[PDB]
Symmetry: C2
Subunit: 314 residues, 2 copies
């Protein structure tokens, strides 16, 4: 009961992002089509896909490497830095193009884990103490302690991350993280449960928990999902309150996913916020939307219409 | 110290073109006086013609069609065609949002082009005065209390008080700062600051002096003081009639105060991850405390601008300042990741 859209679904990106991005793009195309919208498939490498290319994209779920008129919005089905660093959002802002998710400044600030954690604190959102390399042996032991996490500041997740168990592992881990990024974070590790909060428009979705068998640091490094998570209602409500504060503090738009550590004393520690969380039917934010009665196709459409209305009011 | 091939990029939106063109011509002559090959590039048309560059340098004009695109150089190719091949760096002789919001820097990054000044994230954060002030506090740099409009009478009373300053949130707008002395003056000023749709800041007014600190790479330049006129506030983007404001480089300050302003400017420059050069503005109260107002990633590059005066006070002439900024942009590009 609402006018149908012409959506261009953008996917692809760098080689390390393509497999996740291609799988998401195909699912988003099919979902918006089942809702009756006209969908165009665009690869960041080859451009607009023809009937044969799109047929093989929607079949094998893989793709190897002035006609966008009437397109109401660009659905950014990207993953990692290609969609997070803000370059594409700024380019689309220049042309008056409508797109999904956060804008250039909001995306770039969220990809900078260091700057994002500064803004968490300024918004009254607790976050684990951290230093940026270089850091002396005294600063690390005084403010962080061991064990601690070393990771590149802006290069996605997992890649280049390692746990520092003592002062003798700090410099090797910094060198390892330095192979993937220019800046390196030294973050205090918080033992506890892994909790995530999706935000859609201006409402927080049901809280979820990611359970790798354990709460110590071996589990964090060597990594079921419960929506809604098994949490005392006050703790779940506080994670939702803080996720909304983080969403507004970074001036995000459309949707976002904020990760927390929940320690044994019941206090939430904000890790990061993703402006481009995975968009498949089984991804974290779509799972949270399902716990609120919102299917994957309705989620993709709502995100499309949120991006349209943002471009209108700019 | 081999001679460079520099593309001086000027133009921007209609409200920025006048001061941007004046800066572009001055930067072209300065770099040409230093022995470099320089090309004039308009954001709305690309490389200039012979008659167009003659008029640019002689009368500081380059009128452009009414349907012209203030950013035609990136949506294409104007940046690589013709003599622009082999350009070492693009000097951004821009003013206002076109050079501050980070869009141009992001697309220049995507094209692999070297350019002057801070990158796209650093420029965008600094242009957002609210976000920048949050980061001032995170860096241990004091800044006056502030609220974003709308704010209740209770919030304004307990957190700010009167007098306060109403201003647009984004650097590079055309709306000026306005001092508000009572609750009745608040809403008319907020309406006059949000005419064009961006956020409105309410910042506690700090009685005292207006000082500004230029930074070149990692070096704090001599502090300057801006001497105002009446019961008002200085506006770093207002034109002002001649003789209205007087600028003193180096400022007549107690040395521990001037040294502290220089230390705080470098912390701000590092905190927002700026590059090349910047200008950090403070209010200095009667107790000798510095309150940071903003940091500018695109301070004016003319003989009458603040940073060239700071550089000159340190024995750095305008041509030398322009060349150093060029080389800093080249060095940053050569050090880029992949």
């Amino acid at each position: 009961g609402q006018d149908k859209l012409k959506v261009a679904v953008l996917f692809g990106g760098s080689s390390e992002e393509r497999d996740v991005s291609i799988a998401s793009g195909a699912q988003v195309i099919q979902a918006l089509r089942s809702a009756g919208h006209q969908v165009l498939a665009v690869d960041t490498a080859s451009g607009l896909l023809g009937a044969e290319e799109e047929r093989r994209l929607l079949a094998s779920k893989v793709k190897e490497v002035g006609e966008l008129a009437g397109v109401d919005v660009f659905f950014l089905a990207l993953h990692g830095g290609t969609g997070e660093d803000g370059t594409l959002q700024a380019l689309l802002d220049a042309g008056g193009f409508a797109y999904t998710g956060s804008g250039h400044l909001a995306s770039a600030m969220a990809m900078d884990k260091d700057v994002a954690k500064r803004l968490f604190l300024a918004a009254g959102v607790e976050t684990a103490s951290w230093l940026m390399a270089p850091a002396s042996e005294e600063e690390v032991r005084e403010q962080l302690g061991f064990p601690l996490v070393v990771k590149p500041n802006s290069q996605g997740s997992t890649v280049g991350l390692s746990i520092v168990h003592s002062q003798a592992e700090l410099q090797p881990a910094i060198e390892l993280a330095g192979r993937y990024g220019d800046e390196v974070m030294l973050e205090r590790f918080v033992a506890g449960r892994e909790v995530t909060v999706g935000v859609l428009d201006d409402q927080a979705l049901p809280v979820g928990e990611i359970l790798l068998g354990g709460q110590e640091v071996f589990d964090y490094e060597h990594k079921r999902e419960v929506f809604p998570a098994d949490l005392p209602p006050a703790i779940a409500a506080e994670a939702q309150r803080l996720a909304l504060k983080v969403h507004r503090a970074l001036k995000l738009s459309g949707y976002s996913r904020t990760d927390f550590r929940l320690d044994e004393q019941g206090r939430l520690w904000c890790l990061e916020v993703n402006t481009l969380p995975g968009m498949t039917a089984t991804s974290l934010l779509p799972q949270a939307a399902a716990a609120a009665g919102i299917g994957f196709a309705e989620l993709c459409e709502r995100i499309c219409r949120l991006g349209i209305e943002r471009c209108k009011g700019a």
